Design a protein around this nucleic acid. Sequence first.
RNA 1: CGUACACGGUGGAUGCCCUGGCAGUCAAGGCGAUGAAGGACGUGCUAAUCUGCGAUAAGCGUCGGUAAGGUGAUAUGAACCGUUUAACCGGCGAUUUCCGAAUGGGGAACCCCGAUCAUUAUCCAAAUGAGGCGAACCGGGGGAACUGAAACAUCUAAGUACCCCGAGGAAAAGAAAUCAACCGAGAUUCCCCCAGUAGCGGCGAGCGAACGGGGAGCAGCCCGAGCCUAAUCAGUGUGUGUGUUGUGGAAGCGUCUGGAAAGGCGCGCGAUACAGGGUGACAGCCCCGUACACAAUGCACAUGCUGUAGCUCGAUGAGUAGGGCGGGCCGUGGUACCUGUCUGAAUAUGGGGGGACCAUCCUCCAAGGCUAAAUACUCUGACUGACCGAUAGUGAACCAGUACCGUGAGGGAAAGGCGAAAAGAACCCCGGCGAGGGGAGUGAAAAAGAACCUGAAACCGUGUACGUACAAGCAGUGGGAGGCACCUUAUGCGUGUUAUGGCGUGCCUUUUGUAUAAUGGGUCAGCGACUUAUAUUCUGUAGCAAGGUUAACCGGGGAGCCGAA
Lengths: 198, 140, 99
Amino acid sequence: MELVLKDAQSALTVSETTFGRDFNEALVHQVVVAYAAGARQGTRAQKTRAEVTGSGKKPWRQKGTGRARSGSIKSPIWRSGGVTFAARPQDHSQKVNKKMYRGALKSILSELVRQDRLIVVEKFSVEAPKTKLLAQKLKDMALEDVLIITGELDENLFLAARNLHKVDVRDATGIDPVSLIAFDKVVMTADAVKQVEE
Amino acid sequence: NTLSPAEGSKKAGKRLGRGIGSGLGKTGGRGHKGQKSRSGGGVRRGFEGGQMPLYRRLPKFGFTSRKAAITAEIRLSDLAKVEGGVVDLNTLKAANIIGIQIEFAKVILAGEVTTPVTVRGLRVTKGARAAIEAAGGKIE
Amino acid sequence: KIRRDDEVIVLTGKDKGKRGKVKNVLSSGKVIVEGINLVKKHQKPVPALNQPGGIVEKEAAIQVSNVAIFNAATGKADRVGFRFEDGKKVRFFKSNSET
RNA sequence: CGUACACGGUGGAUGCCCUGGCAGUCAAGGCGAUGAAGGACGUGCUAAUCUGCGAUAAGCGUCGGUAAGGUGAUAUGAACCGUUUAACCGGCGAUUUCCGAAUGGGGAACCCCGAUCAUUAUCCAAAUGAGGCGAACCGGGGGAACUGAAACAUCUAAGUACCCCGAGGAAAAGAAAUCAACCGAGAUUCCCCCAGUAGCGGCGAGCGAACGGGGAGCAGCCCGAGCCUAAUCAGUGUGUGUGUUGUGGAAGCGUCUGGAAAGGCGCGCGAUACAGGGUGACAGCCCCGUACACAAUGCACAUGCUGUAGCUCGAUGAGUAGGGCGGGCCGUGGUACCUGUCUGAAUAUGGGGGGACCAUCCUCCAAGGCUAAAUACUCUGACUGACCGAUAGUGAACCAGUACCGUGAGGGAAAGGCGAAAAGAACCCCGGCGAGGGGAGUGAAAAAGAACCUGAAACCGUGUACGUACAAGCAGUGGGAGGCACCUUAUGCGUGUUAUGGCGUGCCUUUUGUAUAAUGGGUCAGCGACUUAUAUUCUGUAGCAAGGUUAACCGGGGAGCCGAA
């Protein structure tokens, strides 16, 4: 259909855009919890170039273990080494995929074209220097409660929004599901929508 | 405001698909239950990839053939007609998905649409003689 | 911050109004103001609280939350004593806002 | 004496807290003959431990910082130090016993000297070196077995475990007598891929590359003579940035509840400052602190500069290439590499190589040498964690690697929480008593009084309800009679236990069959056993459809893989 963009005055209408991809509310809830989990530590195992010197290391008995830098790894015997059991790649994270992670990235982009969601803002948004101006454009927008949700834009990181509640600025190029939905929710700009198309 | 956000933290993104109750790999939970193959199931798995063998012993055996030139490169009429134009000999094939690090091919008239472009190839079959003759050009 | 070199003015405890110089600051957060003391058994002006006991922790134990050093605001407290060799601290002391 | 409960106890679970662990990340990274690390013994007015020092002994001096208080952890008594500005935190210098590499000699810390090897050598130790330590990384040698092959002698585990020698903060390799899709690439490692392909193998099980391509990082150069000189060498001056650590400082309203608000409700404010802590209860605006800025230290590497100094001609290295005998090792196959014994060439008008041998193309030239860059731990500093929570987590949040065990190597625990404040029970009676008891006092609460928060179960005593010394045994169900006792769940509606009567042989594995003279448990609580990557083959659900997915590495890539006869 047609996604009504908004001006700085949060005008009723501007241009139009949209994303086509069967949005799945089955594709906007955990993923980033997995991001929230997986992004924080995870002892892989073999992933490391650690090697063995064999005997003759230093005048002393030093078992030829999967050593590296000055401490052993990989070997289940020493910490940070690979787990000796079965079914879990990293630490306490959710095993899984490259496609669903992306499928969620596509599906999420579609979530934007939903009534009870965000709204597209004109490019001029990136101009707003002060933060207070944003709060107003968010008030008249009737989405001030979205501060509990999140925010986004295009070109460069919005210094005026970064301050705002739970705001983790991001650019249309590099946006992760987490950004597209700091909790299956978000908000973007005109140019951003165009850039994200790719 | 300065209140415990109704909720605005991290458990958000998306359940891989259906209600993942817990991490995969779960079958017969902790404790005792089935999840296995009763009888002589234990110390070692059943199969191995062979047999006694009664079937594998000496059936109508064969052998390991010598490496071949590794022809057989689909070059169909059309998809080479409703595309580009003339000059489609050994030099302009990379454009199309017809380019094996090896050699040879063959023409398979998937379509009949006139072209009437010419195509070398280094191979030929019935239909390769037909067309590119009624349409024009010369095969090598 | 609070310094034993600063004069304080009680405002809540039964010693409300008394003026005096701090005698020492403890890591616990309790301050002892010179003047705020108790009367021992053999009539000895020694700082402490009140209840029967044996070996004991001296000091009347005052809370910084109910004391009154400098405190720019509409209060009943008045003047308070305060280093100088710093110089930069003199500028702050000269400002009705800092110290 | 059986059961339930009540009061008190035992015990210590549980709930909450935690000055500890576990894990990850960033930064930083060597110490010693001007005699270190470690250990011993000492040192504070009293000090036994720990820590710090060491006989100038938990300290002395200087500069800077800091700041008015302080005399380590211990908040004791006495005393003393500080504004001739100490305590406390940072550079440089002085002092620095004895043993210890020690090295004169001997020795379980005690008594008398450069010991031993070696170089130079004025051959005098005269001038020097080595001899030790250090968590594990790199290199060079020696080299198993259990085990797998469901036996075992090849093979496999292993070139691993273990032994020897040595370097650095990093090591090895390296400019091609190469590659061999070519009118082509073109130093060497490493990552991804190529490959689980070529190849090996009782060809049984298993074993297993490389060229190339895509990346990271890029640098090429030295030995006989002629000539001459801006490479090198010696010395001088001497940072920026960055990284680590340290440093500067003000401010609190109204109503209600409360012992006290950091509560609830109302109103207001700051934010290049939407970290954390403290303060009588959940304080971004009460205090520290955080932006900000400053200072110290390390970095010190480099750059600049003084005097040195190009370039040219010819050749290019034999017990080697190669062959034979016997072995080791390798994926190496008649086609890997190396050792040992014997034999033994030619030379660029030459020779080697392109996975078999020998004569004809293409490539490149050994038997001499050097060479920057591309990462890797965690001792140490800091940070973080959907990690654990004190029979959890490191063995160690409490004296822990302590108490304790063994001749020794070695082995190795348990023990956390009073209260807002100790504010820690004055005074009195009792008693052998600073014990304890009574009374009394403090506090919101001691039904906090000190292994002291909360405080369960097994269990103990007492007591309550109800039985009960003719009574037969799962110890119930239903029916009908007896009573006694209690009316916080008023209604001919229930409980506690119970007299009497009809029935009724704990609970778990093995076994054809167990109640069973078949095995296991005295009771309790806590503890206590199917998990990882990859690959293959199905299934259910979901998206899109001859196309589809990428891997290393970049939001791009399509290498490559599978499918398409």
